Amino acid sequence: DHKYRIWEAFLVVLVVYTAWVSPFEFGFLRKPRPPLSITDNIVNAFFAIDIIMTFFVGYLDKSTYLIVDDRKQIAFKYLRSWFLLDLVSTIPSEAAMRISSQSYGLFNMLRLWRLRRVGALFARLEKDRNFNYFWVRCAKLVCVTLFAVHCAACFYYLIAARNSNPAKTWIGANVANFLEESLWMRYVTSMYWSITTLTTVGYGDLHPVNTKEMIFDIFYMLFNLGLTAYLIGNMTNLVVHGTSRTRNFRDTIQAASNFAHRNHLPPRLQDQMLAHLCLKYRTDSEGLQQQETLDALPKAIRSSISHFLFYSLMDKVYLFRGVSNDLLFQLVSEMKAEYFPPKEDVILQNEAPTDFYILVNGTADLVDVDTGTESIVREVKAGDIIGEIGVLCYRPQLFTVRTKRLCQLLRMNRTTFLNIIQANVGDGTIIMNNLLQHLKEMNDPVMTNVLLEIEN
Amino acid sequence: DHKYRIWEAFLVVLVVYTAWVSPFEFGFLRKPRPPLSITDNIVNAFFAIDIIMTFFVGYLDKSTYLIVDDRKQIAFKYLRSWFLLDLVSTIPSEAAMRISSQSYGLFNMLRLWRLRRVGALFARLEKDRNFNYFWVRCAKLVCVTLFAVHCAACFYYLIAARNSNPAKTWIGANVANFLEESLWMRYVTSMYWSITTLTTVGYGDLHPVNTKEMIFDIFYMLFNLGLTAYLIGNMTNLVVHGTSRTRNFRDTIQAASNFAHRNHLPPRLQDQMLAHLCLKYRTDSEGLQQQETLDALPKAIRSSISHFLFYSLMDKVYLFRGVSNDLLFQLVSEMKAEYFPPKEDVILQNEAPTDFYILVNGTADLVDVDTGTESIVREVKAGDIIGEIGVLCYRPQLFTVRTKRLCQLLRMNRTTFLNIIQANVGDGTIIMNNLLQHLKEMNDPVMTNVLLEIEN
Amino acid sequence: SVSSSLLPAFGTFIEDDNPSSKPFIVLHFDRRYRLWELFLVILVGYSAWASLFELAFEKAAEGALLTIDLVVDFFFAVDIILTFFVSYLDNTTYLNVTDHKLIAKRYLKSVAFVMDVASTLPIQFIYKTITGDVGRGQAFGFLNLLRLWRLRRVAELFKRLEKDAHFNYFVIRVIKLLCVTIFWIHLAGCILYWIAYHYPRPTDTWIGSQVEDFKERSVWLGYTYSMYWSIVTLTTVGYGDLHAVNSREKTFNMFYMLFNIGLTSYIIGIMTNLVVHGALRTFAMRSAINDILRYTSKNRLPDTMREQMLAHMQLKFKTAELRQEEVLQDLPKAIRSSINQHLFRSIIEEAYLFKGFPEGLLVQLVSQIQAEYFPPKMEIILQNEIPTDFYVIVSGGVDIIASKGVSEQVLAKLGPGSMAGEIGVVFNIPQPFTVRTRRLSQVIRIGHHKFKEMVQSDNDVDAKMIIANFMTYLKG
Amino acid sequence: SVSSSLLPAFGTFIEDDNPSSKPFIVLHFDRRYRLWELFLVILVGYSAWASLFELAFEKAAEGALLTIDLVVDFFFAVDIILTFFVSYLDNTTYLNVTDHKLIAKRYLKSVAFVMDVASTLPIQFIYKTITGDVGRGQAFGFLNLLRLWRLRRVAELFKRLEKDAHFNYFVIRVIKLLCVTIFWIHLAGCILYWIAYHYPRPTDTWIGSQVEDFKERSVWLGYTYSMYWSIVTLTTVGYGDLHAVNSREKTFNMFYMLFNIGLTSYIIGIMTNLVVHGALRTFAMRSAINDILRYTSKNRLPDTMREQMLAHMQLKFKTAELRQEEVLQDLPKAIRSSINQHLFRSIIEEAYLFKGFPEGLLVQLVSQIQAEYFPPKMEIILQNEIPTDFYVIVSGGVDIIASKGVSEQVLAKLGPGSMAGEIGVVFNIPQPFTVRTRRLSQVIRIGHHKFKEMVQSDNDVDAKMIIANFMTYLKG
Ligand SMILES: [K+]
Ligand SMILES: [K+]
Ligand SMILES: [K+]
């Protein structure tokens, strides 16, 4: 596969070389000359090598099988599709010129049949994901336009040059003697006229004189009337699909402001709303962006998400020392993730505890709201769980937790924890012992058991 | 009101005359002349009479009263709105000629203040429904374009004429003697140039010569770059919002055909479906497909609509002898109208009677499909009920019905009828008596009436 | 029968049907009558060019064109005789009138008859027979504009092709943008040459200042110049090759250039609509792909996990598609009942509860049922909830589960014909199990409030054979 | 406080107690600092003109322009010294750095420092300060293109104006179309004249064949010609006035004409998007209103019914718009809980069913309550259906109807603070009443199973005191 790709990737530049050379030789030359007659042999040899090497590889049909390798079918597939056309357009132009000198011009225009290969690279690249969809239309349009311009210029100069009485043509009336100048000076005027006409800026010089050029111009000026109108639809269809984010953001901000103004919220509660909204809309690069539409998946698939993101961390925790791991398979599967902005309060003092949280990233501070002072006695790092004792004993929360960075927290409802403990009561003694015996800092067991041992 | 509309619409005719005359007199003339110095005084007289008759006026507002008559109250508003500018554009130019000789030009361009009355007519008429929305944009755009063209032409000729040395100008370099020709021959060349430049077809004659005209043309060639791109967006908007119905028709037909082919229905069972589907698009305004546009309303509205439609018709019926107001009301405001294509069956032989029908319009023939014969023994017109004995006796329907015209009928199922009867049985006793009182005939149904009396 | 055959744009085959009427009448939707109007539409393309070409280029009216203008007119003369044997479809009554006396009075009272007889009279041929062989006068020749009445047939044909679904919509609405512009160009060129021909001074015209004697030359030499000028002025390219010199033609040029804004500003408004409206479905599906693929890379999840997510989404679009293929909503009940009886009657009878049931209730049990469609692996009935309805399986499998916070497979697979949730509804108990789908299937819902009174409404009640069948099934 | 202050485009005032770190620093979201950047953006407007004007029209580099070019450069030299006292906002964390040794190291490691130092350096004055009088050499002058690096300031400014909701979107994205075109025109006009100046034969140039001595004349007379040619070649108007004669300028002309299709095809793609996306609401509303009118007029119904029919639908759009004003759905629980505390806590307590209820469970109950919106004269609970929900009346009013025959208002004056559907859900019996709204109102939905489990899970439950309140209410 690696060897194959390089070879065809090499056989697309030569197609561009042919697509430039053949019309120029058709129009501006009549007899072969060394500098432009040598590379033709090389490219013909390369294409002959390509033609002979086509039965050493097999076609692939998806419906018939995973892969197809055969001998007879390749012969029938190659013979009846494009064998004759590809074979005939390989004879050197020197060999067949002896039939007649007039054939040398028309023969070289048959080499444009090799332009189908560009038609393959723009069909195989369309159905892909590693390349954008915007860099696959502009290139096509540019190539089409440039090819049209080049072909029109060459044909018009041919019509001019084949005439007798070198005056009374589109070029003779402008320069007295045009057959006595360099071959690279007659090729700029033709392109000047072609791009002057195609963009509809008619200066006035270099215009048709006799009737044949009038007819050619009449036929050439209708194709552009459609080619130009085809290029504005493809630009509106691009501009519309590119300004969707900003309008959505403005609409959401305006709606939130209208809501807050209508219900007359206090000044210090609108800040949290306008902070979380901004954080969510600038966190679209990762995380809780697809999870708005990732909730439509079945439970079987979604249950496997937590295993590769939280199961390893869930093993080594303050609690859950030794378990059958059957409980964890559900506890991890029934967890939710949230984000918090820096310098935000999550827990206040004595407000009917309902949940306990697990810390994954960032930091947090445990602060006791004393009489007029706020100490920083305890600081917690990622890994620990806050609020366990207050929710397992129906007691009000102990301290207040304030974040100091961009955090990420896990949440569980106490009702579900009670339900799962009730479903499996035998394993609850391990949790109870783990809570009881691990109070290992100063004053801690006694402040926790001021009434626990009484009510144990 | 009515008398005010006619007089108000009169002045909007003179505004066009003023807007045409004033630039022409500013640019192409120098001193007043009899033919055009007569109607001006008449126009000033009309506008002055309008000025004096502006204090006996009343206006409407959401907050203000519909008619406010306190004269002194109006003055403080009127004098502070346009009283200063409405007076300056009424003095005859001949009176003001003695102020200065050169001031005759700049004094004739102050009459364009009366052009505001067209700006208060293209927005007042915007909020109306008896006039189409297609013919409120094109007129405005056309008027804007014509005004721009006229003004540009007049200003360019003024610039050309005011200069000394008649040669070396955009017009003197093309015509040998441009100052010795009729006033209506100099007015065509200027408009020729203006429309040649506005549509971007630059021919090549009549181009600027010196620097002042170069600067004027530089400033005039940028306005059109926006005035032309503001005319394609409107046309695209109009085209995209005007071709919806046909795609709907094609999509619906495609969906119906695909579904019918997918379930492999018998060949004869698609014809009824297709006929019924196309009949709604034929009668797109008669209430078949319009039902959801009517079924989005509360109970009272759609209960009161049936009053104007079926109340009188339901009174003169075979049954329903003398029920005063309540049973008839409830039965009437519970029906469901349906349209049927011609030549289609509605009741078959011995097919589990469920409901009866009341015919409003069209005609149908009662058909008895016996063994090998099809009779036309009975024919029904508007008013009579079909399918009654088969639902009050739990007996299969005797005959079949086939229509001969586009008919509209009414329907009601048996369950609702029985629930209504159970709700009020006292009025119900009349109905069964009506049938027995009306099965007094000398024809064949007496044999089955005997059976009914056996089972009644 | 009637509306089924008028849908196609090229008629239908006819064989021994009831609207044969008199054996000398032809129907107006037959196939032989729809291959005769196309011939006239083709010949219309020649009779709009010739009139304009002969309006201006005098002395071309004598030659082969004189013979062709009669050979063509003969057919349009024959059509008027033919139009008295053609039926028409009435509007108040959708019956098609097929009476000669009724169709003979419909035509003589319409302006189409007088216009058709006016637009087929040879003016030049008859005039030279009685008067001099050559007609002139700088005005005699504007009667050639009568034959521009026959464009209604093309306008009518381009309305019978858009409604059909067998034909494209990008190919038919773009071939209608060539005829209009080509006719416009033709008209403008011919009018300009006619203006130039009839002028006092021959050296003060647009063509007389370049070619000394445009008269006394070939006709086609004068034709090419006046097509070249028109095609250059349209499309907004301008050379100084040919321009206007008089004051009779500056005005015509101004009015020609002012009307061309609204046509080149109208071609774009259609070629934009086509491209915009042809590229939506791919946009939506590619948006879904791009949204999903971004999640599976930054978090470095394995290949199988991404593959299953990508393979699962495809079925959802198919479910939406089958949900968007239902069209029987507001048709009259007499057709919905027939369709339902043809589609669903067989499987309802083979139900363990519905055995030995009265035939009266089954008729209206088959009606007012709406089919459903569900993707695989999705809940339909949960556990410990108020019963609301029950379902009947049609064409797919399903699984039964019963657990509090986990999953435990119980019983076995259920094929078509089975019920679901029947246990809880009869006893008015919260549902004792949980049922989940297995493959793309369709189900039939019934309800509870309806079924409460539906059974009680009937007079044929057995000795609680509902209970007997239920207990027989439950015992196993 | 982190992202809230950065939202406005022109900063905000600073009062006190902010993260100032007062000694020797200024905050980058201040207001006085946000007016020192607009001044430099204005000065960029002048410095992107003289740089190109001095390339082509030589002999203009000596005069007042030389003095202004230094007076302006003084400020851009001061700015580099200023930018060591500014604070920046991090990315991994959302804290703003206010330490000098951290902001100093960030600047020197980027290309902005070196590019600014290179751009702000005068080179024309110094390199002839003592070497010679004036500079030449046909290449010395391409060095003036270094001062085009200052356009990133305008590029950044135009991004902060579209994210604000106090500014339009049809006026900010249309002033962005003048600048690009004017700069493009100026650049092309200067380059062409520069090409014309340095040529061997002066009679074979575009301007040399119209004016014999374009040199030795004023620079403005050579400026007007080259601006006129550029504006003519753009916009696609072409006279034969001035064209190309050489082979050095035919090529530049070709490329200039090829690069213009993509811009004249890009202005339309924006002016056709603004108009289209500004006119949808009116289209939909007009469709509805003219849908009403066509039906009522044809059926000959009086104006009396249509007066109410038209006005009824107006409230439907208001209800839909009020529904679309809800945005808080995925925010963490600690925010929704507090908002519900501020909005819904008082009315829950004052209910007969909920009186004396434990406060520890009210907090759990007063959360996760999502409200609804109903148009006037709608129905929410019908009669005789399975119980699912009961309701709470925040505002508006509802009425209870229970008479199928001759329906009327009896036992129905419910207002803010009452309840509906209580009896059916609490007695496990089908609903015995139907309730209808009166005006636009908002209500609360609770549920059946959740309220059943909530009381059961608790231990200190009010036993039959709920029953006491219920019997007190129900008795009368
Ligand atoms: K043009
Ligand atoms: K042009
Ligand atoms: K020109």
Author numbering:
A (entry chain B), B (entry chain D): 54 to 509
C (entry chain C), D (entry chain A): 54 to 529
The authors write:
AKT1 is the first characterized hyperpolarization-activated voltage-dependent K+ channel in Arabidopsis thaliana, which belongs to the Shaker K+ channel family. Each subunit can be divided into four parts: the transmembrane segments comprising S1–S6 and the pore loop; the C-linker which contains the helices A’B’C’D’; and the CNBD.
The electrophysiological results show that AtKC1 inhibits the channel activity of WT AKT1, the constitutively-active mutant Asp379Ala, and the phosphor-mimetics. Within expectation, the structure of AKT1-AtKC1 displays a 2-fold symmetric assembly at CPD. The inner gate of the hetero-channel is also in closed state. Markedly, the C-linkers of AtKC1 resemble the “straight” C-linkers of AKT1 Mol I/I’, while the C-linkers of AKT1 exhibit the canonical “kinked” conformation as Mol II/II’. This structural observation mechanistically explains how AtKC1 exerted its inhibitory effect on AKT1. Different from WT AKT1, no extra densities that resemble loop1/1’ of AKT1 have been observed near the “straight” C-linker of AtKC1. This indicates the C-linkers of AtKC1 preferentially adopt a “straight” conformation, without the help of loop1/1’-like elements.
